[PDB]
């Protein structure tokens, strides 16, 4: 097993969340299934994938993180902030020799950039 | 952004789920926080991480997948089966030139191995 590849993310609004993940996070189009209301988006070419799945009821917070380089922590924080996203951190994770940034998607999920 | 690094997984029983993720999936010990009832486990050295978080109420199914090599699909299916885990697939994902195996963790989450 080589790492984490994909996560399914429950979203309140497929279009608004697709806009966030593609325009703000820069993920690339994959497969938009307007029938099931799912959108499969690619992370870093073919390195990862998020599957946005529309669900209008029963909200529950999710947490997941994306890998970034330590040297890119401040640029990424600034880029998110410029696009209107509030960013917490950097937070040092001494026990794992890591640095994290924390921010929300449009659904209030707890997203993170982690540098190792 | 280089890929997906970590997912938080809600579990009914921290010990039973920790046993599954370490003994069956082979993830390595990281940080066991018996206070918050969380266990941070490493995937493929430092390539990824799962954070098991005990929650005894409000079950909701999660979906996530781990990256594997295409040539390892049958060995991994067999290995899981040998450890008592029922495996579905391989399923060809033609649109993304991928192959998937599907199986459950002890919480009934929808886990997957994806080969690209």
Structure characterization notes:
2 copies of one chain form a homodimer. By secondary structure, chain A is of the alpha/beta class. The first copy, chain A, has a single domain (1-116), classed as 2,3-Dihydroxybiphenyl 1,2-Dioxygenase, domain 1. Helices cover 18% and strands 46% of the residues of chain A. Chains A and B meet through strand 1, strand 4, strand 5 and strand 8 of A and strand 1, strand 4, strand 5 and strand 8 of B.
At a glance:
The structure is a homodimer of 116-residue chains. With 116 residues, chain A is of the alpha/beta class.
Number of strands of chain A: 8
For the sheet with most strands of chain A, the description reads: 4 strands, mixed
Helix and strand string of chain A, N-terminal first? EHEEEEHEEE
Oligomerization category of the chains in this entry: homodimer
Strand order in space, largest sheet of chain A: 1-4-3-2
CATH H-tier superfamily of chain A? 2,3-Dihydroxybiphenyl 1,2-Dioxygenase, domain 1
Number of domains in the coordinates of chain A? 1
The helix-and-strand class of chain A reads alpha/beta
Organism (chains A, B): uncultured bacterium
Protein name (chains A, B): Integron gene cassette protein
